[PDB]
Amino acid sequence: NDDVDQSLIIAARNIVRRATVSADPLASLLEMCHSTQIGGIRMVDILRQNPTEEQAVDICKAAMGLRISSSFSFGGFTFKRTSGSSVKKEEEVLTGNLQTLKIRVHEGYEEFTMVGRRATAILRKATRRLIQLIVSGRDQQSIAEAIIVAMVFSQEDCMIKAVRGDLNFVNRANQRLNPMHQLLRHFQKDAKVLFQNWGIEPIDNVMGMIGILPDMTPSTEMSLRGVRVSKMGVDEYSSTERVVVSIDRFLRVRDQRGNVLLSPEEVSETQGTEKLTITYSSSMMWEINGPESVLVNTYQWIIRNWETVKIQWSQDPTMLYNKMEFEPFQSLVPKAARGQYSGFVRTLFQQMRDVLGTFDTVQIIKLLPFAAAPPKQSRMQFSSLTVNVRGSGMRILVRGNSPVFNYNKATKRLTVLGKDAGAL
């Protein structure tokens, strides 16, 4: 139960992380979710049974047409609106650096329950204002994280005008973050100016409640405006409804009303160790076990599906070259010589078809991944073809064997960087 939940989080995150970089994240996510196994069982089956509420996991559930929490993730915290309501109002605001940010202001009194990985809090909010913030946490650092998220979430004018410099944050795919996430990522790096400009007020130590100061230290006497830290743990226990959600190509999970509940920006960067053995069968996830395993899995896949490849190679070669299974291999090839190696190898195959009785098989399986890229005019007679592993550029010789591709004709077995990789 617990080992399945933990491995499901680590599984789902790696898929959502990989999906964002792809040209069709939604399709890539489904391809990987339908192919991946976790401890013998399919992930497709796990997502139906398992009630694990997590950012990356719920994005997978949304993709397959399953219900998820009505709550939304912001700054890695799940916001459960226990009471109140609001209405949207799109407004432009100038930061401290005079940068205009178009933000959806929520007009109305609302009570939230922030649920974090290292912290918990009960937020009381009004229009462009924070009324109160009761907070628990493991350490003072985890408390500060929740405070910074709550200060940005309130959208106060002091928070906007505390910004210093230009906000140009981007995700893994080099795409600008929305105005609210621009503020989070700024203040998460450093927010001493925010804490200073927010405002301090005197407090009463009463309900096991203590203050917190701009330097992130405990204080019985005074505290930040609206912020109280409970010595004990915050009691919550409020079930959220499982609601139907729509999901677009960018993995932006939206509820019935049209609010973005989840996104790949909310998926945590933590990469835990796997309890149960996760088995990714998708070609996109050959990169997960390093560049070394990519070269192994590429030549394995060709050997496994050789009879199909051989028919394709002869008749429709453009179909073969444009397979998505050669994309991991092509990332390892140096960007300068990607099209040049493709042009070289695609000639060598043309000559093989032209001269008819020059059919090598070993040479084809060896060089076929280089032909995946769009070809370019090469001067030719490449002694070797560089393929960048971890830093070091291990080169594959055209004629004969190499450290990367070692085939012994006696054994009829392929060795790739020491490890075995199929047989014919």
Q: Rounded to whole angstroms, what are the CA distances from 102 to 93, 94, 110, 155?
A: 7, 9, 22, 12
| CB neighbour list of residue 326: distance below 8 Å, 6 or more residues apart | 298, 368, 369, 371, 372
Report helix, strand or coil for 350.
helix
Q: Which amino acid is at 64?
A: M
Residue 154's nearest CA partner among 135, 130, 120, 171 is 130
Residues 96 and 108 in one domain: yes
Query: Environment class of residue 19 by beta-carbon count within 10 Å: exposed (0-12), middle (13-18) or buried (19+)?
Result: buried
Residue 28 near residue 18, CB atoms below 8 Å: yes
| CB neighbour list of residue 310: distance below 8 Å, 6 or more residues apart | none
Q: Tokens standing for 80?
A: 């459960």
Residues 301 and 348 in one domain: yes
Residue 153's nearest CA partner among 135, 179, 180 is 180
CA distance 321 to 315: 12
37-38 and 242-243 strand pairing: unpaired
Q: Rounded to whole angstroms, what are the CA distances from 291 to 233, 327, 365, 391?
A: 45, 12, 19, 10
Of the candidates 184, 215, 238, which is a domain's last residue? 238
Q: Which amino acid is at 43?
A: M
CA distance 14 to 273: 12
CA atoms within 13 A on the CB side of 97: 10
Beta strands in 273-376 (DSSP E): 278-279
Residue 167's nearest CA partner among 150, 189, 149 is 189
Residues 47 and 135 in one domain: no
CA distance 420 to 402: 14
87-94 and 77-84 strand pairing: unpaired
Residue 258 near residue 248, CB atoms below 8 Å: no
Of the candidates 238, 257, 291, which is a domain's last residue? 238
Its sign, for the CA torsion 67, 70, 71, 73, is positive
| CB neighbour list of residue 205: distance below 8 Å, 6 or more residues apart | 220
Burial 308-321 (b: 16+ CB within 10 A, else e): ebeebbeeebeebb
Using the structure block, give the residue that is written with the tokens 């090839």: 333
Using the structure block, give the residue that is written with the tokens 């949304």: 62
Residue 294's nearest CA partner among 260, 330, 258 is 330
Residues 268 and 315 in one domain: no
Its sign, for the CA torsion 107, 71, 31, 285, is positive
| CB neighbour list of residue 266: distance below 8 Å, 6 or more residues apart | 55, 73, 74, 75, 76
Strand partners, 227: 133
Residues 157 and 209 in one domain: yes
CA distance 225 to 205: 15
CA 335 to chain centre: 24
Q: Which amino acid is at 95?
A: T
- Phi/psi of residue 408, each to 5°? -95, 120
Residue 344's nearest CA partner among 321, 367, 319, 313 is 367
CA distance 53 to 32: 20
* 350 dihedral zone (left: phi>0; alpha: psi -120 to 50; beta): alpha
Report helix, strand or coil for 186.
helix
Q: State the DSSP string of 83-146.
A: EE--EEEEEEEE-TT--EEEEEEEES-EEEEEE-SSEEEEEEEETTEEEEEEEEESSHHHHHHH
Residues 30 and 135 in one domain: no
| CB neighbour list of residue 289: distance below 8 Å, 6 or more residues apart | none
**Terminal Cα-to-Cα distance of the chain (whole angstroms):** 42
Residues 206 and 251 in one domain: no
Element (H, E) at 243: strand 242-243
How many domains are contained in the chain?
3
CA 222 to chain centre: 40
Of the candidates 217, 238, 259, which is a domain's last residue? 238
Range of the domain at 56: 1-70+239-281
Residue 39 near residue 305, CB atoms below 8 Å: no
The percent helix, strand, coil of the chain (3-state, each to 5) is 40, 25, 35
CA distance 189 to 277: 35
Strand order through the sheet with 72-74: 72-74, 77-84, 110-115, 119-126, 129-137, 227-230, 209-212, 218-219
Its sign, for the CA torsion 259, 263, 269, 275, is positive
State this model's resolution in angstroms.
3.1
Helix crossing, 55-63 with 2-21: angle to 10°?
Answer: 70
Q: Rounded to whole angstroms, what are the CA distances from 68 to 56, 61, 162, 412?
A: 12, 7, 36, 51
Determination approach: X-ray
Residue 209 near residue 203, CB atoms below 8 Å: yes
What is the CB neighbour count within 10 angstroms for residue 143?
21
What is the CB neighbour count within 10 angstroms for residue 97?
11
Residues 57 and 172 in one domain: no
Residues 344 and 398 in one domain: yes
Residues 269 and 309 in one domain: no
What is the CB neighbour count within 10 angstroms for residue 408?
10
CA distance 286 to 292: 9
Q: Tokens standing for 301?
A: 């896949």
Residues 197 and 255 in one domain: no
What is the CB neighbour count within 10 angstroms for residue 244?
12
Burial 342-366 (b: 16+ CB within 10 A, else e): bbbbbebbeebeeeeeeeeeebbbb
Residues in the chain preceding a C-to-N separation beyond 2.5 angstroms (breaks): none
Residues 60 and 117 in one domain: no
Residue 102 near residue 114, CB atoms below 8 Å: no
